[PDB]
Point group: D2
């Protein structure tokens, strides 16, 4: 496959970075097959894109029937009842105070993008506040909202005004909830007025930021100041959504609820679909024709996104996600005594991660974290990187992993840490 | 259905407007079936996305075959062979001087968005110039690039700086090529320096602008303008691309070649995929990791794109387009004499349109466009509106439409213009 | 001590970004006469760029400044106010072309004046948008550079510039741009760039200063007034250069039946002293909260005292009528020189804001060289002339309105001789 | 009584946006003494907000301005230059702490100076980024408001604001904010807001003026210089308020071994006249092309003549040490007052830029009411005190460095007494 590696280097730009050396041929559940027969259990699931697994039999049958019905029709002209079919369901499952309304789009960056458009149309305000280490997409506005410059926005500036970043709460790094809230106070006193901020966008637990959970200390306080200053709270559950946090949405772990929320990735279980759900009054702010997109709500994707929403419940992967999470929680917790480089492990449900620090100084180092990288797939196990420094392994296995599938990779994960 | 629509209003926001309120059941080539089994000839193809028709036997077989393989990988992690030489297949076919390289994404707005990121990474310049009436997407950057405020960006401002709009040459409306070039010179002397403009983006034929073809002298001068000031000429062929204009890409009708090209819509023939092609060195300007997207290069959509390029070649849809549109153009000019409202008949290939003005004045009638919209509606024929005044009908039938199906629709079209 | 020594010391001590036009350095100035450090007497047709309509060191202005010099030179008005600030504001409120009650705030520079007009407009409407016109000049600060409609050289190298700022086309039917063309550009901005319900103000000069002395037609101004009336936009008139008797009236807006919502004043406001101001409808001016407006030097006591005498000199010496008398005589000469000099393509202006445009006869393409040759020969004859326009082919005549009749006659003789050569 | 008729006139004729601290109007000022129109004599501890380090109407400054009145008041330097501009730039180049050859460009207002500083930095680096600190104040223009780190009341209602402008945290160990706290706030801006190689300049005051007189530590200024050296950033020191003998040295940056790339000057640079300047490395200053920098009032000849005399006064009267002597005596009084005044939480400053911060004794919470109480009590006893700070709980002391010691001792007697009550 070495010749195809170079066939790509001369046909697709260097900007599309790719981690693993080998290509894909077939995928099942959480097991990937290379071109050369190698079998690797997927602890990545394409970045939380397949909570219900690679090619789950139900929605693969739901996309097959949806195929010979219609593949595309542009919902803006000819609508389909499968669009209203899901908008009904998520409006009943989303943690939004009062009546909820849902619009669907294609990519997750478009969901956060449209949440900004709806937040701006309802508030009439320009301001948008995110947090350091937060990731919200790769388009112009979403890169501005993203809190990691390299490599996400290196060389694509300048970026629009009225967008600033607070500090995300993180007791593991010595920043408290008060430290986080004070950075917001410093933005209101130096950057932009509170009555000029349209929305505060927030990952319930940060995805590419290092799997750091926001405390209920932070959320209830956050809900308070936006209610004071007329700001809308937006929860970005593109990565944390759909049963991986032990519950359907990570915001269900909290008592107060966001006015808007963006969803994608495993929302369709491996097919291009995003969406925005929120309060009926705020979502109804843009005028007709203001929201759209050609591929918005791909009929095959809404059919699968309907399907995972049945695997949601009959398989009950919310309860399983807490059972997978808590055991791998234990595997790395006595590996903590065996492997000294572990400084902390964190996660809710099975959205779990482990941070590794070099012993001489407690600074990160991604090449011990990334020493585990190679040993894992050397054993046929694909683990993804994370963090502001690259020092955190995030475990993104599908929720549909058989238990023998899991314990294999778990004890293989026991061998990567002591070598 | 009556309940079906009102279920749709309480579940989905008013922002996502919809044209027809009959909901699709079935789709095949250029035929659409609705809740009541009523057969409608499709002259929209979901906005030029189904150039090869609804569910083409070749691309479904390529899509169903890819679903036996895998759902999705996040190309960023484990890549495909599907991705690479679909790009090799477009690198040789795209009108790009010298070696070409191709990256793939999902939505057309993303392709335009990434074409800007590549233009910014290559030139280090912030500036971007588009034209009034142009449409480039609905995200923050693409809304600023779009040259129509209503309804695509009412309530979503403020918009970023260094984005200005020239005037598109509309020789059928008093705007010459010299007028259009002077608008660009006026931007250079008042808005932003030329050596600060990274790219000039335009559609070879304005899609929602009214199907205004760009004259050859305007494109030649545009090439020399960017050549003189180090600007990159981006061609937005998301709507004009893939055999609709008689040739593969609309830029092939000109001797000048753009530095960058954006594609989507009929690229995958009813599946979510976009892409950017251009000179090898400029597209490699972004750093590894700067370009990305989780759904980018969807395996099924890549397999669908592979067969779409097969279909238009073996079925000779490039040559078919112009003979479909030539037959359409002459029955429009036959009705030109006994109908008083036709003021112009624009189009190239099968990207044809006809503009209506009120007979007593020169103040266009959307109603007459809606009235003729309301006649083919009750007569089983779906066509779209466009133009800055909503007074021109665009003919976006699938190129795969059978001859008897087309001859019927033109008959129906002739009757609705007379009355 | 000597000029070239000073020129070298200048280039080694100051940055090249501060360009200098003339070879010589000033030693003494009075009315419309300049004496360089070598004794050469120069007829000033620039007046510090339309700053000394009342002439250099007018006795009444100097006597007013010398008097204020024995009281106080600065107290920071936002800390300790003074009567002269209030009285000058009252005088401006009466004379300003403002519909209804007016209020005035004083600042230091014309760019600060435009800046505070923008700030006032944004506070009242709550909207980001601002629309100017190509060829407009409104200052060199970040926002005023964005408002300025000439990239070279005011904006080269200082980008990127803020959003919600766009430029229409200023009408000059002497170039093929009608009022209808100008309004078409505005409606194109409204349909492509920014919605009219998001534009706070439209800003234009009644006569474009360095834009070539192009006069806004009443056609254009009335349409702008109704357009802003319909879409809730504020009409800001930048009279920094046109203001104070330059155009035959105290303010160039008085030539029109249309009144602006806000107006910026500077340059000739203080007759050679640092002062600027904003006057407008009281309801609009009161939009910013206490503390939102200011500036340390704003309303300098010496400059406010000077502006008091300037308004006095304009009235007591009838300088508005003088500007019309002088300008009519100037257009008389420039148009007689039309028969003897084919390069003259246009003679435009109002009052003593007169200009002449030059083309190369071969085609209708500007001749900036012929413009420079006229400047150099006038300098050779001791006459300082400023160029302007988008192509540098326009010579503007900014003589002080107090220029003696005999000196003006000699300058016109120099003008006729230079135009034939 | 008679001031009330003037206040009603002031309220009806000028907008409410120009706030006014004192309800009395000045009639005469001299050194550090103010006389209102009612005969009341006030000791000036404001000096027009640090504009009069040399005092109100200093004899040598007035005689220099009066000499310039008999020659010329304005020619626009970009048209006809003058020698005094060059010689003042030559003096500023020799005196400014700039590594290597320096160049100086003069403008009018402090905001204009900062505005041209970013224009020079943007032209030199080609980068859009600008980083300031919360609590910083740099002017009231659109760009300087964005750079200003205090939203109320400076930018309330004037947004939206331009991108590529972010605010770090200014170090104040008295507030629990270390230098490490400050440095890492910059790295978070690098990691989340804008790449370091896209930041054109980091701008800071050596001592925050309106921010509460918080002095930058030496290790913070050092790491800032290293930060900019690594990433090609330019270091800009804003010495509009700290400049010219206020801090015990001619420039506050001279208290450090670090030298900035650019420096802005205003306020007391001309000792009570509208003048501002930008001095920096010659290579950096020459980045803007000819015609890119300017301003009609820039380098006002009267204000330049005053600044020439201000420099002579600072040297002839040894005002740098006098500022150190007056500031030490003030800190002694304030520290002795701390016992019978539990509200005093801190005594900050350097030289004669000393301030005192007040806290409500129950919780360490600011008490602007107590601060205003000290202000109003001192005003009743004839002492004019200003407030600063992010929370308005800081009183700053900006007496003219030329204040007579008997009047200074008297002012300290009042200050002591209004603090014991």
């Amino acid at each position: 496959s070495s010749e195809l590696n170079q066939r790509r280097q001369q046909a697709t730009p260097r900007g599309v970075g790719v981690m693993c050396n080998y290509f894909v041929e077939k995928a099942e559940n959480a097991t990937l097959w290379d071109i050369e027969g190698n079998e690797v259990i997927d602890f990545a699931a394409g970045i939380a894109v397949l909570n219900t697994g690679h090619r789950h039999p139900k929605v693969v049958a739901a996309v097959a029937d949806q195929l010979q019905a219609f593949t595309h029709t542009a919902y803006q002209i000819v609508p389909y009842e499968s669009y209203v079919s899901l908008a009904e369901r998520i409006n009943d499952l989303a943690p939004i105070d009062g009546p909820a309304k849902t619009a669907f789009f294609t990519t997750g960056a478009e969901a956060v993008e449209n949440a900004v458009k709806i937040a701006r149309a309802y508030t009439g305000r320009p301001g948008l506040i995110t947090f350091g280490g937060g990731f919200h997409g790769r388009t112009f506005m979403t890169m501005a909202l993203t809190g990691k410059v390299a490599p996400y926005k290196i060389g694509f500036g300048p970026f629009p005004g009225s967008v600033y970043h607070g500090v995300y709460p993180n007791a593991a790094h010595g920043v408290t909830t008060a430290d986080a809230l004070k950075s917001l106070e410093r933005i209101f006193k130096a950057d932009i007025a509170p009555d000029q901020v349209a929305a505060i966008i927030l990952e319930p637990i940060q995805g590419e930021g290092g799997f750091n959970v926001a405390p209920a200390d932070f959320m209830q306080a956050l809900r308070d100041l936006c209610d004071t200053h007329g700001i809308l709270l937006i929860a970005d559950e593109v990565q944390t959504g759909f049963a991986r946090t032990g519950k359907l949405f990570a915001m269900q772990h909290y008592e107060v609820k966001p006015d808007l929320m963006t969803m994608a990735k495993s929302l369709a279980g491996g097919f291009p679909l995003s969406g925005v759900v929120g309060r009926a009054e705020v979502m109804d702010a843009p005028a007709p024709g203001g929201l759209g997109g050609t591929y918005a709500g791909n009929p095959l994707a809404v059919a699968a996104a309907h399907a995972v929403l049945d695997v949601i419940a009959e398989e009950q992967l919310c309860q399983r996600a807490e059972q997978l999470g808590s055991h791998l929680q234990e595997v790395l917790n006595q590996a903590r005594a065996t492997c000294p480089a572990i400084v902390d492990v964190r996660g809710r449900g099975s959205m779990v991660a482990v941070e590794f620090n070099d012993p001489q100084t407690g600074e990160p180092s991604p090449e011990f974290t990334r020493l585990v990288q190679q040993k894992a797939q050397e054993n046929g196990l694909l683990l993804l990187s994370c963090g502001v420094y690259g020092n955190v392994i995030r475990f993104l296995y599908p929720l549909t992993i058989p238990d023998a599938q899991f314990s294999k990779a778990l004890d293989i994960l026991a061998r990567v840490l002591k070598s």
